[PDB]
A paper describes a structure:
IRE1 integrates multiple functional domains into a single ER-membrane-spanning protein. The lumenal domain senses unfolded proteins in the ER through indirect and direct mechanisms: as a result, it undergoes dimerization and subsequent oligomerization. The association of the lumenal domain promotes dimerization and oligomerization of the cytoplasmic kinase-RNase tandem domain. The cytoplasmic domain has been shown to self-associate via different surface contacts, where a back-to-back (B2B) configuration is believed to fulfill the essential structural requirements for RNase activation.
The B2B dimeric and oligomeric IRE1 complexes are stabilized by phosphorylation of the kinase activation loop, which in human IRE1 occurs on residues S724, S726, S729, making phosphorylated IRE1 (IRE1-3P) the most active form of the RNase enzyme. We determined the crystal structures of G-9807 and G-1749 in complex with IRE1-0P at about 2 Å resolution. The structures are shown in Fig. 2 together with the structures of AMG-18-bound-31 and apo IRE1, including the first reported crystal structure of human apo IRE1-3P. All structures show IRE1 as a B2B dimer, with extensive overlay of the RNase domains, but some differences in the kinase domains, especially in the conformation of the activation loop and αEF-αF loop. A possible reason for this is the stabilization of the extended activation loop conformation by the extensive hydrogen bonding network that the phosphates on S724, S726, and S729 form with the backbone and sidechains on the activation loop. The resulting rigidification would make the opening of the front pocket, which would require an upward shift of the activation loop, energetically unfavorable, depending perhaps on the number of phosphates present on the loop. A similar stabilization effect was observed in the IRE1-3P sample. This suggests that stabilization of the activation loop in an extended conformation by phosphorylation or binding to allosteric RNase activators may stabilize IRE1 B2B dimers through widespread rigidification of the kinase in the monomer context. In one case, phosphorylations on the kinase activation loop can stabilize an extended conformation of the loop, rigidifying the kinase and stabilizing the B2B dimer as a consequence.
Residue numbers in the entry:
A (entry chain C): 560 to 963
B (entry chain A): 560 to 964
Write the structure that this text describes.
């Protein structure tokens, strides 16, 4: 014996509470136009944040990683918002053990979230409240695939025409512990901009790949640490190639100086999101680019600057012995040079098919095992080379690797 | 002095008629929940196609190139379907002289249309009535960009579970001039399948790049020619690289035999959609692949088979003089070989920076002008190489270039 409430085209069962939240705002499992939806019941006082959210949703929900908005209805005492029904929040994705990823891997989730975020920014919309609770996991589609979506637009702001910034005139919106420092800093001269989302996104990034941690500590001390700048990314191991590239992006995203933070579209171009195949191609491209470069040139000098730590003093001593044996027929490849390590990688990639069976065995298959053969042994190689080769970032060859 | 009709959440002004449909259905411009939408008004006799269209749209509209569905209201007299308001049809995009592309190239439009179609097929839905009139051009977004979309699902066919075909017992749903020949064949033992859409898509493909022509002539005898098999692609010149690749795909899409037609996802992997950079990368990849291949091996033999026409007897006599001079010392490159033409290309690509200014000038910059230097002088090179190298299509290296069912 269960009851049903109907308000215009929106209907729901009061027993199917999906969760509470803000100002006693309750979310029910509901129905609209014969499809399953989530229904947000809004209190009379929050008709402001609802009228804001609903309008901003109309303008940007077409993007696949922005929650789909269906309808809204006005009652005698309440306002109702019908949006796409989702399976879980990102917090459940990260913290629930044995969670069905269903093809949705952490980096892809982050890529999707950033895509949705980039979409909002292209529409001059700043979110200002990006957090694991606001990032939803979709229901499985007909092919069993799931995706990530940005939601909860009640605190979003449409930037005024001609402005790339906004003021904290409407106080400080957001949830404690995910707020950009320049939002609370009283001495802050620069008006906050899109980068407040980038900061929060950064914390979310670290939160996902660390499987639950936060760059600025535990619940109560987070926001205090943020204003202090006391971040700690010690779940990212310094000798792990994946963690190294992850740290390089994350520490830029949560940088204390807002102008130093990469835009959403810039973030999407980072090696963090590169496949193994693209990584090897970058390695090949830089090798060919520096092949006829002089050793005293700005490029090679930049590439070898701090190179000893990258090659671990002698890279010919840190590879497997069938590869060492294959390389003694060359010997022009100096073990103290990053340039020669890259030359040897390119050479062995190019002639791979012609290589002896036993050296193709230690290298592994092209291109995935091959590139991991080196990155796992030289975890700073990609980061270092990527940074150093920024001098060539305007060249046509290296356009898809950098942001412009 | 204008009137407003309000049905539930759907509202529209009767004066704003956007167009007419089949059997009394009229489409007005209107509003739904402060969204600018299109509104289909449907008669009680066509409630069948309505609830069908609604259902299928309540499944497959989750794609950028499939029309968005918002809501349906039912009246005392009519039904109302609220869908995304678009700016134009493909017919108006093509036939209206000086139609503002607004950043929408013809090929991208064909890529978008095919993607939307592939989405429908993945959901076991056959459109059966694909045509320029129901391929829609979106309203410009905030950035002023537009896209193409598939619409008009009233005649769509949801295949039964476990079925990959459907019977013709309903008759001939398609529009004359875009109907696959197996739909109007008295003999065919084979039930129609997804490929009826591919045939229509092929006709649309050629319709766009020819800027108004049809593979089977003018409207008066199109369908007649379709049954005859009298296709004609006159607008595609036999010695132009772009047209040679375009012809190769279109001829397979409008093939008389349904089984010969490529699936929508297969279509998307065709060189027709390859960027200039991807074309050059493909040339480089097969060049590196056949470098240590035996000259008597299956791969090289396939590649040289018909090579004379490809390289125009001797490619060294069909390239520019500054390049001739720079390649003269390379006696290892045999002028009658397709493999060696690809080798010279890969070599000049790899050493491009080291090349003297004069030869870099005739080649042009990497990669755009460079690849066009060769495809324009050898219009069949890519088409020939792509077809020949299908022997290696199952290999990891060439998987992104080909399709695997």
């Amino acid at each position: 014996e269960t009851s049903v409430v109907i308000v215009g085209k929106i209907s729901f069962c009061p027993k199917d509470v999906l969760g509470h939240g803000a100002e006693g705002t309750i979310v029910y499992r509901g129905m609209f136009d014969n499809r399953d939806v989530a229904v947000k019941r809004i209190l009379p006082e929050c008709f402001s944040f609802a009228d804001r959210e609903v309008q901003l949703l109309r303008e940007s929900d077409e993007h696949p990683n922005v929650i789909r908005y269906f309808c809204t209805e006005k009652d005698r005492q309440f306002q109702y918002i019908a949006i796409e029904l989702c399976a879980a929040t990102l917090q459940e994705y990260v913290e629930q053990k044995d969670f069905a990823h269903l093809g949705l891997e952490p980096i892809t989730l982050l890529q999707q979230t950033t895509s949705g975020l980039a979409h909002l920014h292209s529409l001059n919309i700043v979110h200002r409240d990006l957090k694991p609770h606001n990032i939803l996991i979709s229901m499985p589609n007909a092919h069993g695939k799931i995706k990530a979506m940005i939601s909860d637009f009640g605190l979003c702001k449409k930037l005024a025409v001609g402005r790339h910034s906004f003021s904290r005139r409407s106080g400080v919106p957001g949830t404690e512990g995910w707020i950009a420092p320049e939002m609370l800093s009283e001495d802050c001269k620069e008006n906050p901009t899109y980068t407040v989302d980038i900061f929060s996104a950064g914390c979310v990034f670290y939160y996902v790949i660390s499987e639950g941690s936060h760059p600025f500590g535990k619940s109560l001390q987070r926001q205090a640490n943020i204003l202090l700048g006391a971040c700690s990314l010690d779940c990212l191991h310094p000798e792990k190639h994946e963690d190294v590239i992850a740290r390089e992006l994350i520490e830029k995203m949560i940088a204390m100086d807002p102008q130093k933070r990469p835009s959403a579209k810039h973030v999407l171009k980072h090696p963090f999101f590169w496949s193994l195949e693209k990584q090897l191609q970058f390695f090949q491209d830089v090798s060919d680019r520096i092949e006829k470069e002089s050793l005293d040139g700005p490029i090679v000098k930049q590439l070898e600057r701090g190179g000893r730590a990258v090659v671990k003093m002698d890279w010919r001593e840190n590879i497997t012995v069938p590869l060492q044996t294959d390389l003694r027929k060359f010997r022009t490849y100096k073990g103290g040079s990053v340039r020669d390590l890259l030359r040897a990688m390119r050479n062995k990639k190019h002639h791979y098919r012609e290589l002896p069976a036993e050296v193709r065995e230690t290298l592994g298959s092209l291109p995935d095992d091959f590139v991991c053969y080196f990155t796992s042994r030289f975890p700073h190689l990609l980061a270092h080379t990527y940074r150093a080769m920024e001098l060539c970032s305007h060249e046509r060859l290296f356009q898809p690797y950098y942001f412009h």
